[PDB]
Write a protein that binds this ligand. Sequence first.
Ligand SMILES: N[C@@H](CCc1ccc2[nH]c(=O)c(=O)[nH]c2c1)C(=O)O
Ligand SMILES: N[C@@H](CCc1ccc2[nH]c(=O)c(=O)[nH]c2c1)C(=O)O
Ligand SMILES: [Cl-]
Lengths: 250, 244
Amino acid sequence: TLIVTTILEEPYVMYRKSDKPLYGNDRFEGYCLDLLKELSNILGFLYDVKLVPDGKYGAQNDKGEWNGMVKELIDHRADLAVAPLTITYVREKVIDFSKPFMTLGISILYRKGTPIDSADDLAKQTKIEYGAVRDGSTMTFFKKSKISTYEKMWAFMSSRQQSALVKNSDEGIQRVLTTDYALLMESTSIEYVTQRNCNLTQIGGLIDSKGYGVGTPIGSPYRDKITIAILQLQEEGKLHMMKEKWWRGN
Amino acid sequence: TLIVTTILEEPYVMYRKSDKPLYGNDRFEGYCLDLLKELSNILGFLYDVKLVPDGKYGAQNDKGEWNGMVKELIDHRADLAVAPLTITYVREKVIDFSKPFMTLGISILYRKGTPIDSADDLAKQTKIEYGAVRDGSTMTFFKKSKISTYEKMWAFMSSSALVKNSDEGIQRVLTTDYALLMESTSIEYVTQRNCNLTQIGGLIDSKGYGVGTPIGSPYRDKITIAILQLQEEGKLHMMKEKWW
Ligand SMILES: N[C@@H](CCc1ccc2[nH]c(=O)c(=O)[nH]c2c1)C(=O)O
Ligand SMILES: N[C@@H](CCc1ccc2[nH]c(=O)c(=O)[nH]c2c1)C(=O)O
Ligand SMILES: [Cl-]
């Protein structure tokens, strides 16, 4: 029985609706559980889903130690990390990633019918307010960016005690709906939102690029085996099917 | 020395301008040549560039036999494939790809300041005409697309909306109420030379170019790590603006 570390994140991993207490894997549902089920069928394994105790994806601290799902893999307390775990340079040094089951990037959430076309257009004015989730990977991107357009945007975002920023995605979406505000976040989030709000849309293309992949400890045999399975699922069109099932609104 | 197979394709790989005949790697320049240089300064290796003899990227015939750069990697006549090589399922069965060093696809070239936000908006109206260059890669997509929103667009392109080359499509946009559907690379080209035009929305039929290695290559993981390092450093973006 494999130990699968994961994290609550709509619509990847969610508590299953019930009128009676549930136990084990039946407690959870979502894109990642459907993915995991398929993985266990193709590769032939038993698995137990365990939410990461600290509720974090994985980062380094001041002392240089890891936490979250990344740490659970490193310490071999989990065989697989099946969650929207971002494939990054720093993580690739301590854990292994399969082929990304999903590709994405930073983009713009805003209203329909407006003349705004791109990040370029947001940066050249101060009327339409814009920002991102505080201390998220999107804010970090703009914070470190040496691109002139994104430097101008960051200087704006951080001005006036960072009032343009928001606490989380839910707050950000609400701000977009209620005020004249454009939110910067992952294209996966934006589509989840736009499918459930018919007067919102994505503006422009992807600002950066990365992927979500299944994480394994370094040197694990499951790394190659999952990549093979994901390729098969991609070829069958099942990955597109799975995304459609959980992303569509009504 | 590592043998690097590649293919001529502007502006990834091009012949270097010269008064005299050039030799070796200096014969070539472009986006992929810069990437190859940076990759060699991260991993640390020597390399010899060799154009794929048949001039093909890599496809399979009726017997399932491969050609092009893909075949060169299979036969171990090349250690790396640094080129605009599309990451596809059938290719991933026989060779290894790194993480994409470039993401592209189909998008819309149109005017600035308009209420148009996506391909969906064009598909649900008719006043603004839209199309693509005939029998181009963009056209081939919409045809063999079993996605109705793109089928409905193709139905409208089939009713004149198509153009001969990218050069006609550009001017047709500038002069008429027309939206041009083309590869995102060709768009970035145009929008830099025409300040009144812009890309509308994101990518359609999105795909990635990855570095190719033979299956079981010891450079695989190293290349992926290097590319991650390069894009997160923002050097891949810088390389793009340099050659586009
Ligand atoms: N809701 C968004 C992103 C979810 C999300 C939020 C924070 C993350 N932090 C990490 O460190 C990581 O690897 N992945 C993460 C994914 C979506 O639906 O794609
Ligand atoms: N001109 C465009 C795309 C170049 C291009 C054209 C045909 C291809 N055919 C393949 O099979 C393949 O793998 N890559 C290919 C790349 C650009 O500048 O990016
Ligand atoms: Cl919260």
